[PDB]
Write a protein that binds this ligand. Sequence first.
Ligand SMILES: CCCCCCCCCCCCCCCC(=O)O
Ligand SMILES: [Zn+2]
Length: 280
Amino acid sequence: MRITLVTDSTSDLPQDLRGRLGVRVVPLYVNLSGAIYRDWEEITPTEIFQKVREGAAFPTTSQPSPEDFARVYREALEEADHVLSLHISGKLSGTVQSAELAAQEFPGRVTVVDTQAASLGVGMMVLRAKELLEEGQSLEAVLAELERLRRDHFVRFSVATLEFLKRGGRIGGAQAFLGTLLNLKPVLTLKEGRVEAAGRARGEKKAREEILKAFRAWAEGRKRIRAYFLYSGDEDAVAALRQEVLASGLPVEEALVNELGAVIASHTGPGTYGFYAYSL
Ligand SMILES: CCCCCCCCCCCCCCCC(=O)O
Ligand SMILES: [Zn+2]
């Protein structure tokens, strides 16, 4: 049957992929300066940080409403038989819940998937699902592959400060570094859809080494790896990291790079960089 993919703006997919692939995007919002802005279309991470730097109130974010999703599902079903809706971790956002409430309006026609990921971690799964669907694979085959990716993928990232994670409430296990991190650089990951601690290093360089150490360990035995790099601020840290990965001798066949969306950046904060990755 005809299956259409829907995701939310936090999947942080470049416009040059999502648009032509027929992926529909439901936006999330950033609350700043007393106003509400749509992720990607009306605000950037740089603008948010500039406002903080200037003494403004911290940014907050909002998930889409059930009707935001229902309008998209209704439109998609006008020319499709089923909708596969992929979203940021249910433990990080109420987005999945809103999607599920909207899905009830089209019983049998919408499958909502909690990817337990964020940013391009969600985006890479959307792209993998699309790749399979365009070849002609069944919903089942695709859902089975998505479950494999949920269980088996890689992610490491660092941030300039843990303050945005703390204030926004998504710090999760990284809270262990609050009273123990000092001046060191934190290395974080996600497990079961929740942020967790994954080491600390003296200096940006050592931090990158620790991330490549983890990557090599995870990469063992894999013949085809696709990586997705993300950043907020300037691209140098992530660029050096991507270079070190592409020169590691590991079989990385894809190494896409994009800036984090304003919604994700509102929680990670400035100087965020890292990468998600999976194999096939
Ligand atoms: C790969 C680098 C990015 C890693 C991102 C993990 C850090 C947690 C992100 C939290 C985003 C929370 C968005 C909430 C949106 C909302 O429902 O209001
Ligand atoms: Zn309704």
